[PDB]
Amino acid sequence: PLHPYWPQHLRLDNFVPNDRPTWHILAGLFSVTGVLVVTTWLLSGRAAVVPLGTWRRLSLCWFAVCGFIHLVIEGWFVLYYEDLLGDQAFLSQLWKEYAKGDSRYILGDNFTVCMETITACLWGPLSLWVVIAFLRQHPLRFILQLVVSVGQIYGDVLYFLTEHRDGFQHGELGHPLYFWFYFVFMNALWLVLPGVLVLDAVKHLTHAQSTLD
Amino acid sequence: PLHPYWPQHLRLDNFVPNDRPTWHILAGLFSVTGVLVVTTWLLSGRAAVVPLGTWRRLSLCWFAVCGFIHLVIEGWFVLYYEDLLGDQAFLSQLWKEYAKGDSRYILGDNFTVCMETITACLWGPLSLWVVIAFLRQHPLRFILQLVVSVGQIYGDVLYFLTEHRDGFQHGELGHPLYFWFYFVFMNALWLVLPGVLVLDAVKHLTHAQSTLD
Ligand SMILES: CN1c2ccc(C(F)(F)F)cc2C(=O)C12CCN(CC1CCOCC1)CC2
Ligand SMILES: CN1c2ccc(C(F)(F)F)cc2C(=O)C12CCN(CC1CCOCC1)CC2
DSSP states (O other): OOOOOSSTTOOOSSOOOOSSOHHHHHHHHHHHHHHHHHHHHHHHHHSOSSOOOHHHHHHHHHHHHHHHIIIIIHHHHHHHGGGSTTOOOHHHHHHHHHTTSOTHHHHTOHHHHHHHHHIIIIIHHHHHHHHHHHHHTOTTHHHHHHHHHHHHHHHHHHHHHHHHHTTSOSSOTTOIIIIIIIIIIHHHHHHHHHHHHHHHHHHHHHHHHHHHO | OOOOOSSTTOOOSSOOOOSSOHHHHHHHHHHHHHHHHHHHHHHHHHSOSSOOOHHHHHHHHHHHHHHHIIIIIIHHHHHHGGGSTTOOOHHHHHHHHHTTSOTHHHHTOHHHHHHHHHIIIIIHHHHHHHHHHHHHTOTTHHHHHHHHHHHHHHHHHHHHHHHHHTTSOSSOTTOIIIIIIIIIIHHHHHHHHHHHHHHHHHHHHHHHHHHHO
């Protein structure tokens, strides 16, 4: 058909197909984020006021990845959601590819735009501030971790609930790549990893409160 | 016209007007919540493991009010949003009156239903658990306060942002009772009082973290 997105009765003008093969885009994102992850591992190795341990370093790598994604990938959507169609910039093509599992990013839905606006403006800088805090053993580190994780979980839950109440019409149900991987799995992370970071922070802050009392 | 809600080109069947005068409904809600507030004041007076102080007692009264509202008033909407029109139950009439400043509660918007579902299921019981925690000086008290306040702020911000992006079409702009009071003021509380409770909790938890370190 003219366009690949769901529902198929959509009428999208100014749709022009992605020029690059999709694996260019996907592999570029994975390569750059892997470089970011290894660089953050090294940084936590050499730039910590006191040693951190393996799993906290991995948590900082996660927070750096979240900061990059929210500031750049989602920020590009928030800036240019009106012109994702008919554009051949790298991040625009990435969004066009991703939206085949969720067409709300092409339709400019109000809830989506608002949620990604909040995510790009608040949770990205706060995710990087978490890393800065943990490097210097500042206070607020577990507080910021808890706040960011709670916000991410709330946003993802609202996202899933709204798409469910719409009947899963913005994406083909049961398609391996577009439903299970793009829509479910890549979002289920922001339900699972933040959750572990909420149970963890609560364990430490509580131990602090019992120390005062 | 047939119905009072905005936009006026809406076509609502099964609309049947409120039977009671509106001040019955408003005064009943204010009277019962005032009884709740004074009862919570007394309870914090006589049922605290250690004395709490005036402003913390007021915070507990706020949390009890939030718990009642989220569990009952918003829970009624989540349960019966399909049949608010054409019903003459007390809370149904309350919702019909309130929606004259925001018609999304009559239209059953997906974002509204999902947000109030989360609010009724999570933040109400957690708001009451905050009170129970503060009464017994359990830990988690400031953690729960922070989490509930952050969730309330996030929900209210998304609410306002979505209605703004819609152009303020679900309510008459600049009407004293329906815009400033119902829509803005009654919601601005959940931006102002939670915020003060986020700056407060951060002050205490931080002092705990500095005690461990
Ligand atoms: C569009 N986008 C992607 C596009 C492609 C790829 C891939 F396939 F290349 F791996 C990954 C992602 C992402 O991580 C996302 C960006 C980050 N959000 C996280 C949510 C934002 C709202 O709040 C809850 C969390 C999921 C999808
Ligand atoms: C409908 N409803 C009312 C109806 C009437 C009256 C009045 F006029 F009688 F005072 C008060 C209220 C409320 O408090 C509310 C219930 C509570 N929400 C709080 C938000 C819920 C979503 O997340 C952010 C906070 C505002 C309006």
